[PDB]
Amino acid sequence: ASKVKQDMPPPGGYGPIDYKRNLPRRGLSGYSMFAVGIGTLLFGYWSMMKWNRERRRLQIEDFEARIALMP
């Protein structure tokens, strides 16, 4: 006298299944991104200004060596 055994859902019910779109925001603000970009640009401009002025002085020294040697 065996009872009916059959593939059925468990008692009560199966756990809820997610189906809605899940796309998080995941970012900074536009103002912050622009501000970081301009800050990086200004730091680069200042560094390049110093280095190019030093390069100009070094080139002047190199040219003076040639002027001394030319005669």
Binding site: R53, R56, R57, Q59, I60, F63, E64, I67, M70
Partner: protein, 83 residues
């Protein structure tokens, strides 16, 4: 005062690339004429000795011309090293 603001808002909403390019070009046009360093660059370009400095014949009444490179007369580049 009020038309230009609405136009700028609309342009920033629809064509930010054009607003950015026009702003950058305008700054590039305007700022050099308001800078104190623009003269300095010219002076630097004038201090670079590409060719030989040919000596002058001392006629006896040339006070400001040096007789030796290390003499105090003549142009100075002290402003450049401190820059």
């Amino acid at each position: 005062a009020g038309r230009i603001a609405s136009f700028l808002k609309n342009a920033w909403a629809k064509e930010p690339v054009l607003v950015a390019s026009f702003a950058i070009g305008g700054l590039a046009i305007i700022l050099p004429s308001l800078s104190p360093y623009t003269n300095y660059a010219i002076r630097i370009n004038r201090a670079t000795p590409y060719n030989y400095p040919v000596p002058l014949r001392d006629d006896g009444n040339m006070p400001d011309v040096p007789s030796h490179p290390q003499d105090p007369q003549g142009p100075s580049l002290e402003w450049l090293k401190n820059l």
